[PDB]
Design a protein around this ligand. Structure first.
Ligand code: HEM
Length: 439
């Protein structure tokens, strides 16, 4: 049962900052956007990632997420350049390819009248995408189970359990790290033999991965640090989007009028096409659907910090050493800052107006965090999810399956369901329809 739920009712009663105590230990729970902005942006230098490092160190090492200080600064500067406009445009092709692979599975299911458990399918889709995008590996988890795949999920579950088995985890970590080593070696040879001058918009068309960019850049790093950086991006970009897609499709089942409006846009703008970078700005309603899904189901629902200096939060002075949970769930669903906060309403932000972000929503909306530690994959993931949503909604009607297990939420790094999202899937286009390509 999700720990952030009781925090919502406590926020309603006790306000935007309170101290949650468990005997001799306590946590400050922050649900006020002004206080959130102070911690995440205005006075970020007074904060570390705190217990987040303790939870994640065993798998991410000194990757970007749990890092602080000079290690953080140096690696952020090295990695962000890889996610340039040319790279993101190339990844859109990957997003379409992988989404189409999922569509093929859904199509087979639909023809047989089989119900599908979409959370697991989305988890596989997003794993396949992130492995290829980050380090040029094809997990093909949409198609098969492998030892490497099982290792990733094992390490995942263990990370969240900290949010026999110890040996299983150790073995899984070894297998992933050994796989990353092989990939790094292969990429090194490829860079050695290639004939491309490195620059700000560098990418090898045959291997557009972030790993390849890092190696071609002349990245001054240890093998340990590189593996940790890769592992970190793998975790960061996998279950996050898996949950975004899962919750988006859950939400679509709750509002047929939204589905109708989404179908109208997809049919009109892309039809059967793989989306391109140009379609990203035209898929306005699809983007709003995603925006609204992230508002209702943030990933993660809580951001973690610890004070390393004195500060003032709201009216309250604090010392160093305070463990702080910023409740993104509360910020996103705050009755004071959102009209009909529990309603799934993609048009709560004007369709043709600017896309919502932490700046224009003044820290009441933080889908990708904020300030210096904001997600580096915000554009990547926003586009990834728009592609997957659009291609699936073009091809299929989805409904909650009769007798499906109830949809409920769990604790964890991301908001998982308790038992999956079991849906019926039916085709919207005919097998013998000619592919339709709108321009
Ligand atoms: C829907 C998908 C995603 C969501 C909702 C998401 C969300 C977030 C959030 C909220 C943070 C800030 C955490 C904090 O401040 O403590 C973050 C950090 C980060 N994310 Fe994402 N993310 C997504 C996908 C990705 C992808 C695709 C990548 C890489 C390609 C990525 C890489 C990272 C990294 C490296 C950080 C740490 C940045 C730093 O500390 O310098 N994430 N993410």
């Amino acid at each position: 049962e999700a720990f952030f739920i009781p925090l919502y009712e406590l926020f309603l009663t006790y306000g935007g900052i309170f101290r949650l105590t468990f005997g001799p230990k306590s946590f400050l729970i922050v649900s006020d956007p002004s206080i959130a902005k102070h911690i995440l942006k205005d006075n970020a230098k007074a904060y570390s990632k705190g217990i987040l490092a303790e939870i994640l160190d065993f798998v991410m090492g000194k990757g970007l997420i749990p890092a602080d200080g000079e290690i953080w600064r140096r690696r952020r500067r090295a990695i962000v350049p890889a996610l340039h406009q040319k790279y993101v445009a190339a990844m859109i092709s990957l997003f379409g390819e992988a989404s189409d692979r999922l569509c093929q599975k859904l199509d087979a299911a639909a023809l047989k009248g089989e119900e599908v458990e979409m959370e697991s399918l989305f988890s596989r889709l997003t794993l396949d995408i992130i492995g290829k995008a980050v380090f040029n590996y094809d997990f093909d988890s949409l198609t098969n189970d492998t030892g490497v795949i099982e290792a990733v999920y094992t390490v995942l579950r263990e990370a969240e359990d900290r949010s026999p088995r110890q040996r299983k985890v150790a073995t899984s970590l070894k297998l992933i790290n050994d796989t990353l080593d092989d990939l790094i070696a292969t990429c090194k040879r490829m860079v050695e033999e290639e004939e491309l001058q490195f620059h700000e918009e560098y990418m090898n068309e045959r291997d557009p991965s972030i790993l390849h960019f890092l190696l071609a850049s002349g990245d001054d790093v240890s093998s340990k640090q590189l593996r940790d950086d890769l592992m970190t991006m793998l975790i960061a970009g996998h279950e996050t989007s898996a949950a975004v897609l899962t919750w988006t499709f859950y939400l679509l089942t709750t509002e047929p009028s939204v589905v109708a409006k989404l179908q109208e846009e997809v049919d009109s703008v892309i039809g059967d096409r793989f989306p391109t970078i140009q379609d990203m700005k035209k898929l306005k309603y699809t983007t709003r659907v995603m925006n609204e899904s992230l508002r209702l189901y943030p990933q993660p629902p809580v951001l973690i910090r610890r004070s390393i200096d004195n500060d003032i939060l709201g009216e309250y002075p604090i010392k160093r050493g305070e463990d702080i949970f910023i409740s993104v769930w509360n910020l996103h669903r705050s009755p004071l800052h959102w009209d009909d906060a529990e309603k799934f309403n993609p048009e709560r932000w004007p369709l043709d107006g600017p896309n919502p972000n932490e700046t224009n929503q003044n820290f009441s909306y933080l889908p990708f965090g904020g300030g210096p530690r904001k997600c580096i994959g915000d554009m990547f993931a926003s586009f990834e999810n728009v592609v997957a949503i659009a291609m699936l909604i073009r091809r299929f009607n989805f409904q909650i399956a009769p007798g499906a297990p109830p949809v409920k939420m769990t604790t964890g790094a991301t908001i998982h369901t308790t038992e999956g999202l079991k849906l019926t899937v039916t085709k919207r286009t005919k097998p013998l329809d000619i592919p339709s390509v709108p321009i």
